[PDB]
Amino acid sequence: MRGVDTFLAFKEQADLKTPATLASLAAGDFLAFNSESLSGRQQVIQSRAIRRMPMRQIAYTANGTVEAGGAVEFTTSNYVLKKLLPLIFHSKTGQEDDPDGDGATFTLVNGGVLTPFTAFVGFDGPEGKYVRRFFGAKVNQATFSARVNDMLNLNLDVQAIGKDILQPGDPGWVNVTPVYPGGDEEYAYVFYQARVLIKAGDMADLAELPVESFDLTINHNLNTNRYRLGSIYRQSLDEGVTEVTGTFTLDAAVKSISGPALNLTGGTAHDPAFLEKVALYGKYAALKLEFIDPTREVAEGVPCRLTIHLPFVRLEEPDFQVRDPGVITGSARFNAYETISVTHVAKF
Amino acid sequence: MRGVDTFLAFKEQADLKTPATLASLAAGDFLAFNSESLSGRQQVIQSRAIRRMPMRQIAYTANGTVEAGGAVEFTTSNYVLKKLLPLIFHSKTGQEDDPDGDGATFTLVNGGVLTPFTAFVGFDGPEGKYVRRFFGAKVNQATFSARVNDMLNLNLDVQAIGKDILQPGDPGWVNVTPVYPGGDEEYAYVFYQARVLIKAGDMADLAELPVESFDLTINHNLNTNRYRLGSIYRQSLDEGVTEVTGTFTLDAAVKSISGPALNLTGGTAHDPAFLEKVALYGKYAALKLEFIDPTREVAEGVPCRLTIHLPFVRLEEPDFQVRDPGVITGSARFNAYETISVTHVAKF
Amino acid sequence: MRGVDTFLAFKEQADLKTPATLASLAAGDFLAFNSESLSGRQQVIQSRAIRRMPMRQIAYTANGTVEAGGAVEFTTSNYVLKKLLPLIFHSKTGQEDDPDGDGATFTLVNGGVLTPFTAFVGFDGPEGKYVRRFFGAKVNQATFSARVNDMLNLNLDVQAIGKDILQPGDPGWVNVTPVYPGGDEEYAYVFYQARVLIKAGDMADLAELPVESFDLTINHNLNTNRYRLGSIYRQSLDEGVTEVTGTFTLDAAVKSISGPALNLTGGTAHDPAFLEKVALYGKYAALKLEFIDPTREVAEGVPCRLTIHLPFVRLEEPDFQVRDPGVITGSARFNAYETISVTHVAKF
Amino acid sequence: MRGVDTFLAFKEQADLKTPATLASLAAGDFLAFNSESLSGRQQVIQSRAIRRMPMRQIAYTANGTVEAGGAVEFTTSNYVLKKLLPLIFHSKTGQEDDPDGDGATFTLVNGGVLTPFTAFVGFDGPEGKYVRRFFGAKVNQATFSARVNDMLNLNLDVQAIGKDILQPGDPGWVNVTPVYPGGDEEYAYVFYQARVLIKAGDMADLAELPVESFDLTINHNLNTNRYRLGSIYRQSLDEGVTEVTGTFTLDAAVKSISGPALNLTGGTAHDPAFLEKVALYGKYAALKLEFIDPTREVAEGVPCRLTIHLPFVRLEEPDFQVRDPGVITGSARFNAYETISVTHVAKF
Amino acid sequence: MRGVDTFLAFKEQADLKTPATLASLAAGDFLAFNSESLSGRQQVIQSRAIRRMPMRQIAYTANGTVEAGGAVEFTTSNYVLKKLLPLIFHSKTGQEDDPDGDGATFTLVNGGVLTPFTAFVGFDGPEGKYVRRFFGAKVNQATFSARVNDMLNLNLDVQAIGKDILQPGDPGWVNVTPVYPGGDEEYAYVFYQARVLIKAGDMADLAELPVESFDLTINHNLNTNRYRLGSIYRQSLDEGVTEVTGTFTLDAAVKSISGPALNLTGGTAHDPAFLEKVALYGKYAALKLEFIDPTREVAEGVPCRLTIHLPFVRLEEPDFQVRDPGVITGSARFNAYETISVTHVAKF
């Protein structure tokens, strides 16, 4: 088997306990991924009755609860986002390809819940055909990452209720053929389309920072330990409180490329201690990570766009250490507080 | 001192507390090793009486219990196995060079015990001569490892009661000269002599797997904390329950090279999910790791052989992750349950 | 032995592990080559057991995995192409000597595989007779090269599973007599039959470039490291992704000899920065390397022909350096992307 | 196009990111060069999403960061030096044609910076007209070389932010006509005007060495890897620490032609191991490479002059190997330490 | 200085750290060499304290460890061998000019060590007199080379502890006058005195091969990195394991000139694949490189002789490539394994 012999398909399921059928998979369900590590683990119970034996005994071993889940990396593309953003957030408003050009907005709501889905990891190679079905899956974490000379990546940590293996002849088997968007239909976001914008203190508008890389993690803090008597499976994947953290790498005392000057008082003079003072005084800043593809138009004059609005953000000490006689660089970590919004303007 | 200036010699001792003498060492006791890390550690006790002092004080420090032990790697050869297999297992039946050709079988028995031995790490170089004697030693762990373009290695984790240093002029000193088997007498096992065989479900016989590497660990779980008032030494090295684990690396959907087809129902059709289903359904499989040297005959038509019979084995999820568009490879871990047997057919 | 005393014969084998027999060689298997460098290498394993010895020891050395392969240069002729193009590409459609005159087309297909073959390098000279048989061979790389005052050359880099030596008296020996096409039957392509055609931007048709030389490499990126326990041989030669690169030498600001004008907007005015702008704007160009022999007719009015269609090609900076007061010449490297096709129209 | 059809023009630009316009070029900007190799390279990004495809595909490729730069060789002449010495060093004091006759002195200062410039490589030939503009250029390295029967050459390694192509009809195009100094106005330095002077230990003055050739490299160690999200271009060319190295070829045990005797104690007796002892004892020597043209007067009795003052220099082992029964010759490498000064006395 | 103005003298020193005095040099110490490249290198340490400075600073630079060594080429002659063979090998038995005629035998012993020596490279020319003394020198590598129309050459790679320069007036200076053997006393080995003999398989005796050239390298693998705190010098030159490799050039399928036929079964029929099969089957062969000067008698009927016995040798694939229609020639590389012996029968 080769990685090209395998397909990945997420499909949303009505109830957490009812896996999607392998015959319902259609266009839009199959995603091109960078790597998958979904797996299931069964727990083994050993009787505590003391017995003389040189080694473990089959008659006195039982198997207990099962876990399922793992990571999936994606290159954040057009259809990948269309499929995954609804699985990462609670509410969606609008349509990406809305003609007016405001796209779809994804937010976390007060008592919102995550959509459960079934992950199919199918294999069709010279050795044969079989599908790993992970049912009752939820996105536990989602990291957006942007590096130089790279694309925008999206790493999902998924928790599931259980795994099973479907093979030709099983009661729920269909010989599925993955269908993907055309090469001319699917688009990705590259590093040179990115813009990190910050605002703090009395700054009038968002000023663009020259960062080298950025990461943004949404962590839903699912409770993956709700077991009961009479079942080896998790009984739910209840979501806790969403923790939105992140990091971005940039120099010490950087000036803004565009927008106002980095100055907590809104003045025109640059503050070489801007981020350090933001971190030291516990100020709240507004971030905006924005990808714009001008070469792709969604409306009359509206380009493809992926904006992440993080109003109210608290930075840790920016980590600007004097390590050598060269340029002082560091990574500023941050935690988002009140809300996170994601607007995706895209045409399909 | 150089590593070539040193010798290693294990010798079996009647009682755990009576070290073997340095004059009893003879042919068969000295082993060629890859590396040794046997050492002793003394514990330092510091009085808790509160006293004003800028630093620790010699008058208020005592030294407590001592540990000894460490690792020794070997290239699993003819005489190395002859010497070490009796130290790793509880019972031996037969003789390796038995003319009929079934060799010696080493197994763990119900209430069996490990043989204690003394490890001599001797040095004889331009600087002088001295022996590190580790008395009351037992094999705590033993790992067999096979890699491609390598030999079969055996790593022993040894626990001992204590260490001492013998030097010219001590009451128990003898100027020992290590004697080793002739180059034409000693043989090793190479990777291309190895065969991993598996069996599960209704499979009729053992089918050979094409694995890239394998490891098998026997862990005797010695209790190394039995101290008493009136002695700085361990009072015993009581063995717990032997845990036999292992791992082997191979591809997803491997087909067997020889034997039947990998099929849990004994059919002739290949099952591309064989190991995954073995792990997911908690089935017990039979493994057999076997080295055969046809170029070395022990009987009329019986070749040198080292077989490790692991009936009843439980695999973890085989770890077949889609990491890249190339061949999907992974490592299947396993735990052995009821018994482990080791047959060594060898001529000396 | 002289190079004239040796023959070379490729023969296609059903399975990668079953070498072709030396008795199956017939007309069409024997090829006239410029030079061969096929060879096998055995790996030597040295025991890591530390031992005092001034030099390596025979008793403590083992031999490990084997590689085989090397290069073979051909003068791209009639029968050479007939034999080798099926070994370099995945799919073939048509017959070279098809009466209609479209020849055979060789392409890479989505999940296509390379044909394994056995290479016989036989020697029959005053010293005696013996054959080097390289079994399980695949074409790893194939370079087409055209220079002025030369013929079209084809250099193959071949990887194989192993080598063996056949001699009179061996179980698989036949006294083979090489049979070759008649001098009046075999034809080659000369430099003055070549045409390099390019197209980019809005150019309406392919415009001919005056190049001095060209090279085109197909690289199948075989995985030559798939070894296992129990075998010194490679277990497969799995092909990765085919990388098609190349280079052609020409002057700076060249005009086209025929076809439209080199103009990214399809106009009639020449663009002296055509290739530089193609490389700087990351445009995709279409190349066509075409050999035509009008003196050899395959159909009523169809000449012998070897066309290499490379639609979608990306040039690197054309390398037009001002080195001296003479004509500015340079080499434009390129990488092909979507597909490569090779049409061979030939009569045998 | 011929090398005579091309011109080269450097022009200093106010900010690193604002290229000089092609209409601002005037007398003094155009330089006669020996060879140019300025070029730009775009990086190509390949999506990591695993997909079945025989070859790279266009829809899944993006292009990333760009580099620009290359080498330019000059014959160190009057106006070439006037133009380039200000680009190689940090500070200039004086005017070459100062009547008093001390010329201009170029030095590296503590926190000094390099001047950014735009390099125009223009072509105007039978094929047409177009300019390669390399904007944001800095001198990364500068080598002065003197050989026998040659002129003094100056090789610049230049790093730039990016390249673009200007052509008739572009928004910033002007039909520039290169203007050069008259043949009777421009002068060069020949080998027979050179003098290498050394001083070490207690030597009272500088003693002239008879060297066969010399090289002196200034290396500014620019940081050419400062990229950010949202731009394919380098964000700066920050200069590190200037490393000034060099080499000169001469015979073993050479005596000085003029000045004192080569003697680390200032005595009149020659030391045949002078350079070897300077290198072995880690002594610091003072070098002075000086070109004087007596036939060209800049003041009443002051000739044209190019002096390179390298106080404090450390030689490596002079490389005086006995290779043959002839004269022992070798090359002494050196590293300059504290400061480097360059005085140019010239009339224009 | 000319190469004829210099002398070279090795002298054996009692301890590695005590250089031989320049007054102890006498007849037999001075050797005629082809070329020397002995040199010393001092390491320069740069403080890591970050400081603003355009260039390195003398106050913040220190110099560290020193290396010494280099190559010396000799024409393997009578006295050259007498002097150097004891420095290349561990043990010597016998005297070259022993009347019985078995000469001196040089071998590597189990725990043998190399003799340290001091190398004097003295210069006495019109410029003056001075000696380079390299103390604590050991032979790291020694290559014997034989070509057609050449003499037998011996290239030594020497590692030393340090270098110093002695000059008239130093505390250890003596005006040494080199004394050499008379022209009528010294003899060399020419190519036409050479014989390469091979034996493998069941061959009864050594059969002579017609080779074009040969090389044999002894490599002692000295550890040249044993430095300590408080010293800039190496603390030892500990020798590792001696690797004896070599190569000889010959034609493909060569027959033996004398001795038995090249046949792995001892038969009288020639095997055209002899060396290829020796390399492919991993057989061990016995080589013997032997120079005999019949015109020089050491005993009543015993001629001058230099034999290199290499029992047990493993050849790589002989490198017999079909490059052209002429005779197939190649080079067979080999590694010696168990022992190497060198017998020198010589009269002085």
Author numbering:
A (entry chain D), B (entry chain E), C (entry chain C), D (entry chain A), E (entry chain B): 1 to 348
The authors write:
The hyperthermophilic phage P74-26 is particularly intriguing as it has the longest tail of any known virus (nearly 1 μm) and is the most thermostable known phage.
Micrographs of purified P74-26 virions revealed flexible tails with a stacked ring pattern. Because of the flexible nature of the tails, traditional single-particle analysis could not be used; instead, we picked sections of tail with ∼6 rings per “particle” and used a segmented helical reconstruction approach with the helical symmetry tools in CryoSPARC. The tube is helical, with a rise of 40.25 Å and a twist of −44.75°. Using this reconstruction, we built an atomic model of the gp93 TTP de novo in its entirety, which we were able to trace unambiguously. The diameters of the outer and inner surface of the tube are ∼90 Å and ∼45 Å, respectively, consistent with other known tail tubes. There is density that runs through the center of the tube, which presumably corresponds to the tail’s TMP, gp95.
